[PDB]
């Protein structure tokens, strides 16, 4: 019933995920692992499904084996009456696709040392905040969200599960200068998914015929993913995720934060964002 966050090295975390970090210290990466890394609500499930269809040669018979959360072990995950990501990892064959939201301050150092390829997805802060707010309501391991205005204040000082968005997107953007990281944007995927799939294909070093890429484009669109039981999280216990409170596949839009942010909230957020992202080669689009 909505436990408080726990701080581990400056990072606020779901308490079961904090507990999960102990067993995870004995995780050993493989030169052929591939890590999907995002701040929450930035496109994790979307890119996981794309990467997993690439892994199965574009066939969809093969992606229905089990849910996405079984096919792509979530490193730090754990919950009551649900297998930890470390547990699920035991039964995952190489080459493995792995998922995390851990800041670099917590990331198993084995992944950097083994030079593990990373697919990093970033999304504009305002859509992430709105998506995160609704997520808190359905995903019951999170503390109480509160009102949207108070949730928004928490999001700006990084007092939410996994801490600061502004730091996450910046530190992984720096990492990409020195480590194999394909650094993607949710808004790009939204604008031209085929182009982004072709980018992911080239990073993992596969080629596919164009028909298979079109097939993948269709089967990873918001509407297909919303109705697919394997990707929409409807198979987990109600005590864990309340689908009738807010579906995991909620809207899938770039730019709809405008229907949630008030004008005062926007002005404050914009002033704060400019202090935080002061210098940056890194930039985001709020809208298409
Ligand atoms: N194939 C797809 N196309 C566009 N957005 C999708 C997507 N699959 C899921 N998403 C969206 O991405 C979000 C969740 O990201 P994550 O998988 O990292 O938790 C949600 O955003 P919204 O709440 O804005 O709808 C969700 O609806
Ligand atoms: O990541 N998740 O939300 C999960 C992960 C694994 C599981 O068995 C159920 C849900
Ligand atoms: O709290 N949860 O159950 C979560 C949190 C993050 C995520 O990527 C999936 C599941």
Residue numbers in the entry: 8 to 295
Please give sentences taken from the publication describing this entry.
The cytosolic sulfotransferase (SULTs) family catalyzes the transfer of a sulfate group from the universal 3′-phosphoadenosine 5′-phosphosulfate (PAPS) donor to a wide variety of acceptor molecules bearing a hydroxyl or an amine group. Sulfonation results in inactivation of the majority of acceptors, including neurotransmitters, steroid hormones and drugs, thus modulating their biological activity and rendering the product more soluble and readily excretable. Of these, the SULT1 family is the largest and is responsible for the sulfonation of phenol, thyroid and steroid hormones, as well as a variety of xenobiotics and known drugs. For example, SULT1A1 displays substrate preference for small phenolic compounds, while SULT1E1 shows a preference for estrogen acceptors.
Finally, we determined the structure of the SULT1A1 D249G mutant that confers increased activity towards pNP and 3CyC, to highlight the importance of structural flexibility in tuning SULT1A1 transfer activity. To obtain deeper understanding of the structural differences between the D249G mutant and the WT protein, we determined the structure of the D249G mutant in complex with PAP and pNP (D249G-PAP-pNP). c The D249G mutation was generated on the background of the WT protein. We found that two mutations, namely D249G and Y240C, both located in the vicinity of the active site, can lead to substantial increases in catalytic activity with 3CyC and pNP at high substrate concentrations but lower affinity for these substrates. Structural analysis of the D249G mutant reveals an increase in the local flexibility of this region, resulting in a dramatic movement of His250 that can affect the SULT1A1 active site. The structural conservation of the His250 in many different SULT structures may highlight the importance of this region for controlling SULT catalytic activity. It is possible that the higher flexibility allows higher substrate turnover but reduces affinity due to changes in the active site. In accordance, electrostatic surface potential analysis of the D249G mutant relative to the WT enzyme indicates a dramatic change in charge distribution around the active site. These changes can lead to reduced affinity for the different acceptors due to possible differences in acceptor binding or effects on the dynamics and flexibility of SULT1A1.
